[PDB]
Design an enzyme around this catalytic site. Structure first.
Site, short mmCIF file in Angstrom:
data_model
loop_
_atom_site.label_atom_id
_atom_site.label_comp_id
_atom_site.label_asym_id
_atom_site.label_seq_id
_atom_site.Cartn_x
_atom_site.Cartn_y
_atom_site.Cartn_z
N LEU A 46 0.84 -1.19 0.00
CA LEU A 46 0.00 0.00 0.00
C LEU A 46 0.87 1.23 0.00
O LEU A 46 0.49 2.25 -0.57
CB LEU A 46 -0.98 0.04 1.19
CG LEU A 46 -2.13 -0.98 1.16
CD1 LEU A 46 -2.97 -0.88 2.42
CD2 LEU A 46 -3.02 -0.78 -0.07
N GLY A 47 2.01 1.11 0.65
CA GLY A 47 2.96 2.21 0.77
C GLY A 47 4.02 1.95 1.81
O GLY A 47 4.24 0.80 2.22
N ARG A 48 4.70 3.02 2.23
CA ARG A 48 5.80 2.91 3.19
C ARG A 48 6.06 4.24 3.88
O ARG A 48 5.35 5.21 3.66
CB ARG A 48 7.09 2.40 2.48
CG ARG A 48 7.75 3.41 1.52
CD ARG A 48 8.55 2.78 0.40
NE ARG A 48 9.63 1.93 0.90
CZ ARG A 48 10.38 1.13 0.13
NH1 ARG A 48 10.17 1.08 -1.18
NH2 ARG A 48 11.33 0.38 0.67
N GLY A 49 7.09 4.22 4.71
CA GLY A 49 7.68 5.32 5.46
C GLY A 49 9.14 4.99 5.68
O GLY A 49 9.59 3.90 5.31
N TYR A 71 10.39 4.54 8.51
CA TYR A 71 10.25 3.62 9.63
C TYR A 71 9.64 2.25 9.27
O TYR A 71 9.92 1.28 9.98
CB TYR A 71 9.37 4.26 10.74
CG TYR A 71 9.59 5.74 11.01
CD1 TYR A 71 10.64 6.18 11.82
CD2 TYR A 71 8.70 6.70 10.53
CE1 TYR A 71 10.83 7.54 12.08
CE2 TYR A 71 8.87 8.06 10.80
CZ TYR A 71 9.95 8.47 11.57
OH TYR A 71 10.13 9.82 11.83
N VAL A 107 4.35 -1.02 4.49
CA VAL A 107 2.92 -1.24 4.70
C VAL A 107 2.29 -2.05 3.54
O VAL A 107 2.51 -1.77 2.36
CB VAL A 107 2.14 0.08 5.03
CG1 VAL A 107 0.70 -0.21 5.44
CG2 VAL A 107 2.83 0.87 6.15
N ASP A 117 3.22 13.89 15.35
CA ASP A 117 3.63 13.66 13.96
C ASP A 117 2.54 13.97 12.93
O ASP A 117 2.53 13.39 11.85
CB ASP A 117 4.22 12.26 13.74
CG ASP A 117 5.06 12.18 12.48
OD1 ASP A 117 5.40 13.24 11.91
OD2 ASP A 117 5.38 11.06 12.04
C1 LIG Z 1 -2.78 18.66 2.54
C2 LIG Z 1 -3.32 17.63 3.49
C3 LIG Z 1 -4.78 17.82 3.84
C4 LIG Z 1 -5.22 19.08 4.26
C5 LIG Z 1 -6.55 19.28 4.59
C6 LIG Z 1 -7.45 18.25 4.51
C7 LIG Z 1 -7.03 16.99 4.10
C8 LIG Z 1 -5.70 16.76 3.76
C9 LIG Z 1 -5.28 15.39 3.35
C10 LIG Z 1 -5.13 14.40 4.32
C11 LIG Z 1 -4.76 13.11 3.97
C12 LIG Z 1 -4.53 12.76 2.65
C13 LIG Z 1 -4.16 11.34 2.30
N1 LIG Z 1 -2.86 10.95 2.87
C14 LIG Z 1 -2.50 9.53 2.67
C15 LIG Z 1 -1.36 9.18 3.61
C16 LIG Z 1 -0.94 7.75 3.50
N2 LIG Z 1 -1.38 6.90 2.59
C17 LIG Z 1 -0.72 5.71 2.87
C18 LIG Z 1 -0.78 4.46 2.24
C19 LIG Z 1 0.00 3.43 2.73
C20 LIG Z 1 0.83 3.62 3.83
C21 LIG Z 1 0.89 4.85 4.47
C22 LIG Z 1 0.11 5.88 3.97
N3 LIG Z 1 -0.05 7.19 4.36
C23 LIG Z 1 -4.68 13.74 1.68
C24 LIG Z 1 -5.06 15.02 2.02
CL1 LIG Z 1 -5.27 16.18 0.75
#
Ligand SMILES: CCc1ccccc1-c1ccc(C[NH2+]CCc2nc3ccccc3[nH]2)cc1Cl
Ligand SMILES: CCc1ccccc1-c1ccc(C[NH2+]CCc2nc3ccccc3[nH]2)cc1Cl
Ligand SMILES: CCc1ccccc1-c1ccc(C[NH2+]CCc2nc3ccccc3[nH]2)cc1Cl
Length: 327
Positions: free
Chosen positions: A43-46, A48, A51, A154
């Site tokens: 699905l993804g990673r970091g 650390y 995933v 974080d």
């Molecule tokens: C600019 C950020 C923001 C501001 C205001 C409202 C929402 C969000 C937001 C919040 C979350 C996401 C989606 N982020 C996905 C993170 C993620 N996906 C993964 C998939 C696999 C493993 C780890 C992962 N971490 C996108 C966005 Cl645009």
């Protein structure tokens, strides 16, 4: 020496808890059966972790498997305790199991399945309404962990999972999370540089839940002004300079004077003097649809140098920015 600081809310929650709640070091890890899971796709990673989307063969349900690299693996007891403490809370990722790979002795955390919408594509598509809606979902998660005596430490887009179809959000990756104890001096080397609060950048160790509220303001600013990350520092010193070029140096020096903070002695050559920029200079034709006086007033109340002066998660939820959000 620096003037001490206490949270203005949930100050004493951990003192009224038995030591087993916050004393994660004394927690006994009950290891599940790793043969219960089949890894299907990444699905993804970091930095650390690795995933994967998996299947729990004991109930044929989709699960999320987070494989911890040694850096993340070192703090597993704290992550597990925090996940167990917050399990069932609003918009908090659900820890389902804790397993270990006999071959590599690497541990993994197993979570409830989240059908995550594209990361680099959610940032580009969210409407004004969506942003308000999802910000309110984050605030539910933040007020909950803060009320349970925990700082996430974080908060960033990579740690927020969104299932846009079901309009469901989860606050994930609690590896950097910590229990808040008033008067305790914490390690400032937490979170990503872009989302670090000025308290961290100035080595003010006695921080609290308000640190998450700064990080939340960095996220909102980035979204509405279409600038990712909003404060893009090259290193920790420069990170504060980027902040100062927007918020101004005057409010920064009032903040360090208030808490009697000592900066690096070359501070006048690194920081210099910078005027506070008006939020309107970041408003253009392509992003004006995301900007309203309520969005700007909300932003201004999160991005404050003085950690004690920022809206708490519960006060943020009463803000007029969220009036148009169906509740
Ligand atoms: C600019 C950020 C923001 C501001 C205001 C409202 C929402 C969000 C937001 C919040 C979350 C996401 C989606 N982020 C996905 C993170 C993620 N996906 C993964 C998939 C696999 C493993 C780890 C992962 N971490 C996108 C966005 Cl645009
Ligand atoms: C090697 C992946 C891994 C890393 C850390 C912890 C456990 C496992 C694991 C080990 C075995 C199986 C079973 N595979 C079928 C599933 C898994 Cl999830
Ligand atoms: C040892 C106590 C002390 C006494 C007198 C004068 C300074 C300090 C000091 C206090 C703290 C630090 C480390 N913290 C520096 C924080 C910092 N971040 C900056 C970012 C930009 C500009 C200056 C900056 N200073 C270094 C130092 Cl040398």
């Amino acid at each position: 020496g620096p003037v001490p600081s206490r949270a203005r809310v949930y100050t004493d929650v951990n003192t009224h808890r038995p030591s087993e709640y916050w004393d994660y070091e004394s927690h006994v890890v009950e290891w599940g059966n790793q043969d219960d899971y089949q890894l299907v796709r990444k699905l993804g990673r970091g930095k650390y972790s690795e995933v994967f989307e998996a299947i729990n063969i004991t109930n044929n349900e989709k699960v999320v498997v987070k494989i911890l690299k040694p850096v993340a693996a070192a703090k597993i007891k704290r992550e597990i305790k925090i996940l167990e403490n917050l399990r069932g809370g609003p918009n908090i990722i659900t820890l389902a199991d804790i397993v270990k790979d006999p071959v590599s002795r690497t541990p993994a955390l197993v979570f409830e399945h989240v059908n995550n919408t594209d990361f680099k594509q959610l940032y580009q598509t969210l409407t004004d309404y969506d942003i308000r809606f999802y910000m309110y979902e984050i605030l539910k998660a933040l007020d909950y962990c803060h009320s349970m005596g925990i700082m996430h430490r974080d908060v960033k887009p990579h740690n927020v999972m969104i299932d846009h179809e079901h309009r469901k959000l989860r606050l994930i990756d609690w590896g950097l999370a910590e229990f808040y104890h008033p008067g305790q001096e914490y390690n400032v080397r937490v979170a990503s540089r872009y989302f670090k609060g000025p308290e961290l950048l100035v080595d003010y160790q006695m921080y609290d839940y308000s640190l998450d509220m700064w990080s939340l303001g960095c996220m909102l600013a980035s979204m509405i002004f279409r600038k990712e990350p909003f404060f893009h520092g090259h290193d920790n010193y420069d990170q504060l300079v980027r902040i100062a070029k927007v918020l101004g140096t005057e409010d920064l020096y009032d903040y360090i004077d208030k808490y009697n903070i000592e900066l690096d002695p070359r501070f006048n050559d690194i920081l210099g003097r910078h005027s506070r920029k008006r939020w309107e200079r970041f408003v253009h034709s392509e992003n004006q649809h995301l900007v309203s006086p309520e969005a700007l007033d909300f932003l201004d109340k999160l991005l404050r140098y003085d950690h004690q002066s920022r809206l708490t998660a519960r006060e943020a939820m009463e803000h007029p920015y969220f009036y148009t959000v169906v509740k």
